[PDB]
Amino acid sequence: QPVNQPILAAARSLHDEARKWSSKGNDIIAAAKRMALLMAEMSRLVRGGSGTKRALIQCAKDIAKASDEVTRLAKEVAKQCTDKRIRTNLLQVCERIPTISTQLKILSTVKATMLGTNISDEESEQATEMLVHNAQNLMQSVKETVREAEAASIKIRTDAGFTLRWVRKTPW
């Protein structure tokens, strides 16, 4: 099936990082895996015709919902982190995502309404490239948030209510 390759590369990029660890006792890893799977589906949907537009809009809503889970948990990890340098960096990257995923919902709706003529091929190309660049930025930010959440867990001190499990998966 045809698929928007720039979008697909971004989904695979996050998938590669998230796949390094088990989802078992790690909801950041589970949500990041959901996100990569949904974006990937999205690549197909943007590169599919109208009559599937409702799927494009719902897919962005699902990606935004899964990113809110990543943000919410990464904020809890940060609050339990000893190292100020890591805690601040995690808060910097994590806080930003909600804005990127809000922008994903806007641009998916924009792209979806142009799946149906009157609009120009230029507006259509530009709407795709805006969506592509936003998808890349979102996948990057979550990948960075996975990395820093792992880095921050090493620094947990004393007793913490919001703990996470980082178990590497078997290499081939």
Add this chain to the structure above:
Amino acid sequence: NQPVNQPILAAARSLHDEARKWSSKGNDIIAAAKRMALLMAEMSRLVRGGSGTKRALIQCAKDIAKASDEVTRLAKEVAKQCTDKRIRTNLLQVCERIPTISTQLKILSTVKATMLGRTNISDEESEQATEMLVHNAQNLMQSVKETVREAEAASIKIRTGFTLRWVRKTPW
């Protein structure tokens, strides 16, 4: 009383200040840059404004996009007459970007305009649509400002063809 979006007006103001340095007499690039700067401030005023002015915002964007095209069209003609490769290529680089930004402006103005009438949409989401419009507005005025500057450099080194008049405005 009417509210305004300060960064859009700041960007509009920035281009007006550059375009105001020269006379519109025999320079349709300075004339179009002047109309663009005037329209951008109006568009910014429109964005802050309530519903019932949405059409005004969509039309304003269309006008900015139309005025931008003339600069791209004229700057391409100035570039073809320019002797220096270094200036000719730099002038083609800046003016190439103008149509894609200007296309993205139309998209994001329509997006912003649709949300004016109803509150179904997230307040934060609306802020995101404004920020996107703001950044895009900033980028467009920057490119046009750079295009007007480089067109002046490309008029100096010319052989034997459209002619641009660069007459500086009187000082106080």
